[PDB]
Design a binder for these strands. Structure first.
Ligand SMILES: [Ca+2]
Ligand SMILES: [Ca+2]
Ligand SMILES: [Ca+2]
Ligand SMILES: [Ca+2]
Ligand SMILES: [Ca+2]
Ligand SMILES: [Ca+2]
Ligand SMILES: [Ca+2]
Ligand SMILES: [Ca+2]
Ligand SMILES: [Cl-]
Lengths: 329, 329, 329, 328, 329
RNA sequence: UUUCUCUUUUAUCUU
RNA sequence: UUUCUCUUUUAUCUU
RNA sequence: UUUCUCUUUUAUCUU
RNA sequence: UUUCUCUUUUAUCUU
């Protein structure tokens, strides 16, 4: 309506990459409409993955603002949550290496910093009505990457400081604000900027595990562990400003839970002049006051998650909220 | 008609008999003569849960603060024995209120009193694999004490906490709801006293019978083990009857579901607690609500299938208006 | 005139520049673009305090969550030295939010952002015994890091938290309020950044410089010791300038008083926390309030005598209406 | 609407020629109105370029340092075997002491407003040879995490500059022209807002002392030298300007280099600089969107000839966008 | 609103994005500047098809006249290899237009140009036996040539038809539709050029790479074999992106269905052909439809479930009217 | 995401 | 390339 | 513990 | 198999 005409082309595209379904959004948009207009590279990451769930085991999936990695998972005994004895393994978006090299010290070779725009996820059951069982629970945690300070009895004695994931503890309880339906109904949900503005984040070098090498989980406070594995295949290149989507998928004993898992990521990077990437860059979109306030509203308005069913009805549900709040203004 | 109830008095009746998924501030409080400062804690649990075949799983919704329910499974067609031990499943943030040591429960709050205690089981299995039933009855479980002597030097007499009325779980009460598993169930408990008196927070309790106490001395039929003092524990016993749920899963039956639990509790906050910030005066006496509460409770069925969880609030309002009608004559 | 501000936008301006002894829900939140779930924590300290004669007592109102202020006394006519260490005085319920171990701060909440930071000193001594003065200035104390090498095997390079700008406490800033002790004082701090960005909760910090770190390596002029990890600690550093208060008590002077401290802080709650129950969406952007906030702040005096603590809200409203007047022309 | 006095000054310090007696202005017009001290750093460096060499000058958001210079054989770029040495702005010590732990003694934090650079050839017309090439790099100061086998075993975390690998090649978006023609270029805030960065203590080298260049990922090294003459006091949010003066064999390339820098620092009450401090200018939406627009519009760099016709390029853009938006 | 389109211009948009099961004369033609004599050929295929378990069957909707689709199956979880060959499934009456010898295609018609290319998959299996998924993306497959030398006497240089962009089938494109098998799917392709230029009929083509040509010389990743020149063949390559459909059938899964394909094609008839009798002038330029066509195409999702095949025409009309609205402002 | 009344029942802005 | 009525007789757009 | 308007701004009860 | 308008848009019958 008179709302969809106030937005700039960029402003609109932005809002779609953010809440629109993967199929509808054929155009990632020139990026984020805000004060920043420097050279960037918009990359819409998309993972499609046929996954089958282990029976008699609850599998936890974490979607975090980590570049080049779609999600992190780990399976635990049914009815339980992660423990110190738990470790999450990352699943890379296509071409993670082509972006962040193959050695924990060559992440900032292609790009120096970044900032997330959208970060969606969906689960589409593919089991027949004679085999499905279990539930899909979803909530979001405000996990941020900080640091911890502690002394070390070396010679001479020294004080350490390393990266720690703060608020990870939230994954050990299903917060009151959550989605939770039968497995068969699938689920669809997005995440948004947990900051007043879209500030860029630095690319992080050498990060492979958290707690890192030579550090006890005890000294970090983190409830469980994060392992990206062989530096040559994956790794932790940074941590964005998006709350982390948590997903508990309960699979009963003798239940066949097969589904497709999808993941979106509209990320804006700062290309290095040397990168064979740079030639695809352009300038960040101009500020679009409207789109920005719409984003915030839509975001806070939308439900935790929705069933897979209404994934398409999503874009519409959104376009509704916009005209509704832009009408009362 | 429902305009004879104070704002809170009404809210109260809702927190009580209806699952207020609706995000009201969680309850106002109890419309009783007491109007001192309290904190209305709205506890809510969402637990995905798969039931093992050939087992009759027992769940207890007890008035133990911080713990949503306790369970244990016994072979099909059987009930708990001395050889049985129930393990508690805490509501989110248990430690955030009761600490991590059996002697730091009274740190945050000093006493409490329950207002509502609801529970629902929503099947998540398919229609070809499920089988079995859900049976429900309620037990007048109170928390007393046992007095016995010990041959020490010098010989002395002991006294410890013992749960009376537990023997009620060893059989399916006559007043009960029993129906096919797939149909789920919703049920709630109520104040088993003429008034809403406050109970003290109990320090040191982690197991019943207590460690170093031989079972049967107490006379309890089975055991209650909350586990690590740093993860869970028994902080008190409310004046609510305990809800018993027997879910018998036959052989080769894939019965999964989602369990939800609600608990409106008025706690007396301690000034040194941050939690105290959210304290308000308890609602003023609302003679009408207190008389309705009683009437509604006595009316409602032991439990109902999951489906009628919605029609719940409505079913209540009609019982009220129907009661307020007879009051005019 | 003051009707151009959203309900919260106004509330915000009050929590900010006025001591809201009034029992509003403690603040609404910040009227910034951010609208994610937060918990408005209204911290308030009431500390009776007697000042030792012949000593110039220094108090620091720092943006360290959970700690109202830090103090230490130096001989009259002098300032802190390397030989000085400041001990924190926590707001009530510090542990109730940050635990009892330097690695359990991020348990309850993950990040935060201050909104208000006020402090008042109300003399309680008689008019025949008091003597001395209260001087006040504000320091742009930020929390950076220091990089230095260590002769270990193998030799390595360290990096630890160091407080920059502390040197500002060693002298009475030119922009300052200074007046007789008996006249008391009220003053508040404000966001030392163009926006309200969130800061991470910091794990492990108990002292600065950190244990095992020689003072001066950091370059700090004195030390910060929070003490037992089980009683206090340093959980983060807000983007507020620190308030410095020098209360010089001459020889034989009986100077006693009551100190009050207020702090509106928006924290990002963790779903597993009970505290999360009281979370709400941050207030929507209120362009006007954000522009007023800035204007009011720049206007107000460094500080004012205790007496004008009341006329505070009024003094503010007039500054606003006076600013909104010039906006019409 | 129109610009404020400060909002206009802000746009001049930003892209305005320094021969215009440019006013530092009151600073940056944004939401922030806190006490700050405006410093207009200017360096004039007479310099001769080694023939058969390709000298690399880097303009980085390092306070008190005008630029970092290193040289490599003609036709090549910096390598692991390279180290850049900083040339300080006047009175570096008067601001950040003489110890690697005396930086935060005068000011606690800062934020850049402008960062320009100019090269004015002084060579005659037959003696000179070579070319000047410019491109900008999004170099940011991050951190690296690696383990160390000490007793007991530990994990080490330190500063590491990311995006330096961009200096090892000539960015597609670049200015390239004959040496003699000189050059002028400027950088802008690489962030949506002008946030404050803290002052950094103890930084003298990167990789730091006791760290191999291999542990950092950094393609080469950064050395400020004697903690009593220079050092790294912080890293601002401005893209780093890269200038490659390619001098061939037998080429006499002499020239002057100027470096501008409008910085807003948060003064320490105890510092002498505090008396000079005022409040940051009130937010000026117009200027903040002009700055952003002018920046994106301007070319990477221009020959030193158009250093005066610079201000007029800007005034033009200012009203050419204040025109496509003034109609409706 | 939809009255700004010429009769044909509208018809055109329907033949294009909607399955016109409705028996209109099959399309009017293309509302482009061209108005010479053409014959609107409405190709439609109805193919019953059962998918083998443990195989990931691949289907290609290519702009090859007379052939509805090409398929081949690869082991589950895998894609085509050099060892793969796709076999074409012709629309009815292939020979009735292109003869029975690779050198009699240009007999009936000389050139052509596609207008629509739609495809739908409607599951026919029960809800207890099906399993698996349907994934869809589109490839910019064009038909180029490869130049290489041959050691003959005298030695010479060759040149033959090679399909470029086929490598796109070896992976699931990011812009894709993926959902449970049972949900079916509908999708259509569009002109991958700025205009509707005519393509020549190609004589002699039966296989790619051509007989006597070693695979890989061409650089194609797999092979295309139309078979007997008297039953099928490759008569040309339209300027439409090719539609890729991966139907993964897990082990023991009974996945059957019905596939439908539509193709509006404008051919230039030859006077000696009887077919020429049904030729008419191409529709006159309809600037509006040509601009809508483009807009509608860009909007629609990669694909949609079979169910929304009906709501298709409607979904389109709304996109149009919505576009024509913004054109007034 | 839909429609108002009614009393709610808090909550500030103003005399 | 010319002029309208008439019923044609299909054909969509709209309720 | 005092006086109303005003818009607040949430919040249920009712069609 | 249902209801008309509207312009369609072809198509003959008639001057
Ligand atoms: Ca922790
Ligand atoms: Ca009593
Ligand atoms: Ca007994
Ligand atoms: Ca910011
Ligand atoms: Ca110092
Ligand atoms: Ca590198
Ligand atoms: Ca053409
Ligand atoms: Ca190839
Ligand atoms: Cl796959």
């Amino acid at each position: 309506m008179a709302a969809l005409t106030r937005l700039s082309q960029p402003g609109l595209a932005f809002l779609k990459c953010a809440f629109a379904p993967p199929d509808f959004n054929t155009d990632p948009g020139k990026g984020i409409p805000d004060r920043f207009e420097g050279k960037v590279v918009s990359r819409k990451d998309v993972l499609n993955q046929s996954i089958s769930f282990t029976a008699g085991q609850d599998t936890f999936i974490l979607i975090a603002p980590t570049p080049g990695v779609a999600y992190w998972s780990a399976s635990v005994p049914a009815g339980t949550f992660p423990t110190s004895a738990t470790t999450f393994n990352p699943v890379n978006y296509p071409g993670f290496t082509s972006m962040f090299g193959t050695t924990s010290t060559s992440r900032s070779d292609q790009v120096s910093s970044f900032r997330y725009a959208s970060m969606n996820v969906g689960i589409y059951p593919t089991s027949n009505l004679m085999q499905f069982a279990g539930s899909i629970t979803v909530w979001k945690c405000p996990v941020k990457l900080s640091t911890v300070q502690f002394p070390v009895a070396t010679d001479p004695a020294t004080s350490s400081l390393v990266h720690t994931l703060v608020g990870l503890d939230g994954v050990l309880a299903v917060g009151p604000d959550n989605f939770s339906e039968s497995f068969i109904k699938g689920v669809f949900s997005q995440s948004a900027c947990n900051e007043p503005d879209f500030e860029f984040n630095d690319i992080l070098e050498g990060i492979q595990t958290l707690p890192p090498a030579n550090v006890s989980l005890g000294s970090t406070g983190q409830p469980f562990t994060m392992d990206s594995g062989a530096e040559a295949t994956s790794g932790v290149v940074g941590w964005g400003n998006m709350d982390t989507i948590v997903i508990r998928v309960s699979a009963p004993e003798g239940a066949v839970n097969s589904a497709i898992l999808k993941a979106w990521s509209c990320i804006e990077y700062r290309p290095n002049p040397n990168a064979m990437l740079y030639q695809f860059g352009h300038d960040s979109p101009p500020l679009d006051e409207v789109a920005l306030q719409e984003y915030r509203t839509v975001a806070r308005s939308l439900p935790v998650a929705v069933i897979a069913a209404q994934t398409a009805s999503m874009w519409e549900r959104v376009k509704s909220i916009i005209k509704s709040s832009l009408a009362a203004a």
